Amino acid sequence: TDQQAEARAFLSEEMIAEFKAAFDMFDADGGGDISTKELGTVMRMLGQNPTKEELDAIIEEVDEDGSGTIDFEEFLVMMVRQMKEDAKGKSEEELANCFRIFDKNADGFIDIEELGEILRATGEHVTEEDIEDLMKDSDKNNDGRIDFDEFLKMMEGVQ
Amino acid sequence: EEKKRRAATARRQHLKSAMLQLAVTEIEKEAAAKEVEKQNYLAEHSPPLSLPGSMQELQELSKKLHAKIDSVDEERYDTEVKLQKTIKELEDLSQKLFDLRGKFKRPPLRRVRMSADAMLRALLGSKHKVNMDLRANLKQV
Amino acid sequence: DEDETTALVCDNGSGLVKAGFAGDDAPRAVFPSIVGRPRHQGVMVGMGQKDSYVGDEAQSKRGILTLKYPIEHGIITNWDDMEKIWHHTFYNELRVAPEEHPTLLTEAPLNPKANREKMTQIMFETFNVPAMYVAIQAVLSLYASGRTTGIVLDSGDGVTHNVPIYEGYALPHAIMRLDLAGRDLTDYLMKILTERGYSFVTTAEREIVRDIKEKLCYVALDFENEMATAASSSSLEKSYELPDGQVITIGNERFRCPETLFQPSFIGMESAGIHETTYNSIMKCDIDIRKDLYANNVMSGGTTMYPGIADRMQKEITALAPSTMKIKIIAPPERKYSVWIGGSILASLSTFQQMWITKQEYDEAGPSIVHR
Amino acid sequence: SYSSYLAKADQKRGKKQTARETKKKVLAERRKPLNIDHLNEDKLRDKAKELWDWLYQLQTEKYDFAEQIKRKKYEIVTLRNRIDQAQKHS
Ligand SMILES: [Ca+2]
Ligand SMILES: [Ca+2]
Ligand SMILES: [Ca+2]
Ligand SMILES: [Ca+2]
């Protein structure tokens, strides 16, 4: 129930509103929870073809009451974890891409030169000091370059 | 006692965001341009077909194609296998890093299920209005 | 990564636990398999009253606690005290929370069906791990040496075993167990060393006889004309310096200790020895598989580390096997962790994912599910 | 280390020969003879293009599998730098 807490804390009425409408369609009989079968039907409508094992695992992932079914609460939890994972994937993908664009020389790094270029390539006004400063702040392993790890870190937050 | 130092950091951010912002707009440029290359490549390796006369030509051409098919197909296969090999090489590397760091960002294989935004769209069709991402919601005015 | 990083491998022994993450090359955690219970009420400075102690804190503080071994001869004998060693492994040694890590465990050769179901009951129902799996120990040792058919002579702290394995299936009716191992072996050295005119009187004298056994002991080939050699008194002797100056010398007994593994008669054991037992396992197996087993005698376990163990075994079974046969005794260097490494490999593997017993399987099939 | 030479032969030859037939088995399936020869005249027309599309079909995929490896090859380069950077035997 503690999870169902922050979970509902996370979402908005809007969210809940829709996640409900969605939950209702999952739930055939309209009883109050998705069964190992009610789920199977929706999955296929969603274009999958899970197996008994697969289904349960997907069920008991948020079944805190060992019911073997999912209620609109356990469900919101599930949606949340997903919402999370989705946003994380999209982020790292974008950054990953950005790194390849900034790299271009494909050495797997971003040297003060490229950093300058890309920076100077922005509209913004910048002098070398700015560039070297950003390098010094980003390059934690003090090797001159900026590795993907560091790039993830440095861009951590920025939009 | 470095009272002003605060403005320095904000700059890096302002710049970092000037960078990302730059990235994204460049990202789709390369993307489309890339595609352009794809249609040109295909442009010559298999140009808008023009069915010949009637007798020997149609038959001939047909034989021509059909043979090329086994050809290209083989190449397609060899390629698929060099991919398999590659994906393999990076999975192993995607290991030599795990048990040396732990779970790290951006695993190359990425096991992804369908997004909740997808499932929502898929199930409610028209009425699915929530550009969900992270932005929480607290009373406006 | 979800579980690529995340799989745990815990090898439960009679003397030591070996533990760590699937992926690593060696165990992150190695420690005694004891659970100490304080004989008196009181505290250490700055700590609270402790009901129990596990691993090295139980060994170090042994004078005020009653020490207990949960695994007798490779089999879990006390389940209250084992759940204590597991708890310690996850939470203190590896410092992980178990409820988000798949756990590969190991069991012994003819481990009773009911035990494999009980540790599954405790893994899933009191530790709430996502998924788990129990591998047989000899089977992980073999596999860690690349192969799938061979016979493992496995020897650790409380048991020795021979487990003939064919295309992965350990052969129940050909497995042999000999209850004489490294524990028995340290206590015999003890006596042949006090018998050399010495005294391991305080507990700082007791413990180090075991470090003498590990560092200086040998398995000589032609143990016959090695005693004979001892007598002419060559520079075969070897003096070890104790916690203090007290330089103790061990010339000869140095190899009289592992000759116990070929001659159990040195210790009032009437059972047959390691090499004969390798062989008997083998003439208990199918006929067509006996050339395979003979060319694949894989050794694993702390007690098989005595140098020249492999050469003695090489010649011990050549001379019992039909001459038409190829003998081959594989003894790798990392062998004190073969079992563990075989688990690390297997559990980090790309194809193993589909054999993990998940809480879905369990909550739906009962402990029977993993029991196979 | 020359007793391992016989391992090279056995191993390489083995795997390589295994790979071959597989490729043959696989590629063979995806192949339906040009059986249609002299059964109609306008048939060639509705036929020829179908072959044409199948070709274009394969061609396009080959191009993608290709660009893919390149992208992956770069994932590697980076994934290798993260491996070294994450060395620090300290
Ligand atoms: Ca229902
Ligand atoms: Ca429920
Ligand atoms: Ca670069
Ligand atoms: Ca750097």
From Swiss-Prot, chain A:
Residue ranges of the TM segments: none
UniProt: Ca(2+) 4 binding residues: 139, 141, 143, 145, 150
GO biological process, one term: skeletal muscle contraction
Annotated GO MF terms: calcium ion binding
Residues that hold Ca(2+) 2 according to the record: 63, 65, 67, 69, 74
Record's keyword terms, sorted: Calcium, Metal-binding, Muscle protein, Repeat
Domain EF-hand: 14-49, 50-85, 90-125, 126-159
One cellular component term from this protein's GO annotations in UniProt: troponin complex
Residues that, per the record, bind Ca(2+) 3: 103, 105, 107, 114
Source species, domain of life: Eukaryota
Binding positions (Ca(2+) 1): 27, 29, 33, 38
Miscellaneous field: Skeletal muscle troponin C binds four calcium ions.
Family from the record: Belongs to the troponin C family.
General function of this protein: Troponin is the central regulatory protein of striated muscle contraction. Tn consists of three components: Tn-I which is the inhibitor of actomyosin ATPase, Tn-T which contains the binding site for tropomyosin and Tn-C. The binding of calcium to Tn-C abolishes the inhibitory action of Tn on actin filaments.
Name assigned to this protein: Troponin C, skeletal muscle
From Swiss-Prot, chain B:
GO cellular component: troponin complex
Taxon lineage: Eukaryota, Metazoa, Chordata, Craniata, Vertebrata
Family: Belongs to the troponin I family.
Parent-protein start and end of this portion: 4 to 144 of 183
Residue numbers spanned by region Involved in binding TNC: 1-45
Self-association state and partner proteins as the record states: Binds to actin and tropomyosin.
Keyword Acetylation: yes
Annotated protein name in UniProt: Troponin I, fast skeletal muscle
A single GO molecular function term of this UniProt record: actin binding
Taxonomic superkingdom: Eukaryota
Post-translational modification summary for this protein: The N-terminus is blocked.
UniProtKB/Swiss-Prot annotation, chain C:
PANTHER family associated with the record: ACTIN
Name of the featured protein: Actin, alpha skeletal muscle
Record carries keyword Metal-binding: no
Family per similarity comment: Belongs to the actin family.
Compartments where located: Cytoplasm, Cytoskeleton
Methionine (R)-sulfoxide modifications at: 44, 47
First-level EC class: hydrolase
GO MF term set: actin monomer binding; ATP binding; calcium ion binding; calcium-dependent protein binding; cytoskeletal motor activator activity; hydrolase activity; identical protein binding; magnesium ion binding
Residue numbers bearing the Tele-methylhistidine modification: 73
EC number: 3.6.4.-
KW Nucleotide-binding (keyword) present: yes
Primary location group: cytoplasm
Miscellaneous information on this protein: In vertebrates 3 main groups of actin isoforms, alpha, beta and gamma have been identified. The alpha actins are found in muscle tissues and are a major constituent of the contractile apparatus. The beta and gamma actins coexist in most cell types as components of the cytoskeleton and as mediators of internal cell motility.
Residue list for modification N6-malonyllysine: 61
Gene3D superfamilies registered for this protein in UniProt: 3.30.420.40, Actin, Chain A, domain 4 (3.90.640.10)
Positions of modified residues (N6-methyllysine): 84
PROSITE patterns, alphabetized: ACTINS_1, ACTINS_2, ACTINS_ACT_LIKE
Pfam family, one: Actin
Gene this chain is encoded by: ACTA1
UniProtKB/Swiss-Prot annotation, chain D:
Signal sequence, start to end: none
Biased composition (Basic and acidic residues): 18-29
UniProt record similarity statement: Belongs to the troponin T family.
Function: Troponin T is the tropomyosin-binding subunit of troponin, the thin filament regulatory complex which confers calcium-sensitivity to striated muscle actomyosin ATPase activity.
Protein name: Troponin T, fast skeletal muscle isoforms
Residue numbers of the full-length protein present here: 160 to 249 of 263
